[PDB]
Amino acid sequence: GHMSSTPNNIIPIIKKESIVSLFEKGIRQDGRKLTDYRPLSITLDYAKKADGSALVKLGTTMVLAGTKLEIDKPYEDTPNQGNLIVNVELLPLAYETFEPGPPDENAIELARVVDRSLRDSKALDLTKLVIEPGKSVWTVWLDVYVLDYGGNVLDACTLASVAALYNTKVYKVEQHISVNKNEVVGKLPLNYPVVTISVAKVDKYLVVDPDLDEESIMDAKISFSYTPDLKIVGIQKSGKGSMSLQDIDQAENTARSTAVKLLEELKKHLGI
C-alpha cells in the first residue's frame, strides 16, 4: 500500500521578483527568450556497455539514458510485437533532498510520461522487434538516470531516451536462439524522433524549458509531446496549481512552435 502526499527549494521573497524582472522584455535571468531552450548537448554512445546511450546536458540538467536488448517471449496477447520497458531514476547524486530508495512518484511519472510519448507517437514500432513471430522478440530496456537535477528534467529525459533509442545497436541472432555480440547487424528502427516541450506558467507569463529557480516559483507546468508532423502525442499537466483554459491553449501554441526547432536540433545531434 502507498499514497501521494504534499511535499518544498524554499525560495526567498526577494529572489522571485528578480527572476521575473525581465519577462516584460521577453527575456529571463540567463538572457534567454521566453521561448528558448537552454544550451543542449547530446553525447551519443557515452555508456560504452549500453546497446545505445545518450548523455544529454540541458543547461545544468544532466540525464544519461541507456538501452539493453534481450530476447524474450512476446506477452501472450501481443505475439507479433517486442517490448519496451522505461525506467527513470532521480538519483540522489542529482539534488540534495533526493534520498535513495526505489522510484518515488516523480520518477514513476516521468517514466510513464516518457513511455506514453514513445509508444503513442509510433516512433518505435514494436512489430519490428519480432525475431520469430509468437516465439522470440526483442525487449528494449530503457533506463534513464537523472544525474543532475537542474530543472525541466522531463524534456531532458525525452531527448535522452530518443537519442539512446536511435543509438541502439542490434546484434546478430544465431539459430541452433543466441545473440552474437561480436556482430552488429543493425540499429533499432525508429520512424522519427519525438520531443516533449514543457511550458511553465509563471504569473502572467508562459516560459519554455523552466530552470530550477523558475520551477521553484511556477504555478503549474504543462508538457506537450510532438512528432515531426506536429501531431500531439502526449500531454501532461503537473504541479499543485491550476491553469486556465486559455493558458493551456496558449501553452500548446507556444510549445508547438518551439517543438519545430527542438526537433531540428535533435535530428542534427542524431545524424538524421
Binding site: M3, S4, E109, R116, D120, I232, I235, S242, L245, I248
Partner: protein, 234 residues
Amino acid sequence: ERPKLILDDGKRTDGRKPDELRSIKIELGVLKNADGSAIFEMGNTKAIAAVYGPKEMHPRHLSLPDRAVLRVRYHMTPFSTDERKNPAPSRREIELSKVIREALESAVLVELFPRTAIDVFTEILQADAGSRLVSLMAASLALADAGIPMRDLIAGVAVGKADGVIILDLNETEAMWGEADMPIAMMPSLNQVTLFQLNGSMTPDEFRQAFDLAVKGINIIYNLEREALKSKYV
C-alpha cells in the same frame, strides 16, 4: 482498431451519440466513520471516496507550517477490472494518486489548517474508463461532505477520438481501441483546469475541438454535483 467504434448510424458501441455522457449517479454520506464520503458512478465506472481530517500530522517534520498536507490514495479493487488486478499498487496507481492529489491541491483551502493532514482515500469498485476522474470527483464531493472549505467543486470528463470522431466520456472499449483519450478536470466556476492529460494522438485542431466538447460535458456534470450536495437539504 479491431472493433468498429463508430457504427453506420453514427452512434457508438454503447448507443451514445459522440456528444453524450454516460449516466451519472451520486451518493453522499455513505460511510459512518469517514468525516466525509461519496460514491460516484459514471456509466459502469464507480468509485467510493472517504475523507479524514484536518488532523495533526504526527511526524511532524513532514507537515507544512503554513497549510495542510493532502494525503491521497487512488486504488483499484482486484475485482474492478475485466481480469483480476493484483492489489499491490501499480505504477499507474502511483501516477494517478499524484495527478489526483495535485488536482485537489488547487481546490482545497489548505492554508486554513497549518500543520495538519487531510486524508483522501479513493477505491475504484468498477473500472470502465474514466476512473481517475470519477475518483477525483468522488473525492471532491467527499471533501464537501466533510465540511472542508474549498474554492470550488471539481468536475471532469475524458474526451477522445474514435474512428476519427471526437467523442465525449469514453468507455473502456473506446479507451482501449480509439486513437486518443484526454481526461480533463476543472473548477468550473473559476475557469481553472486541475487535471489535464492526453494519451494517444490528435492534431492540434482535434485537440481544441475535444477540449471545447469536454467543457460542455464538465458543465453538465458540475450541475449534477451541485444538485447532489443540495439534495439532502432541498
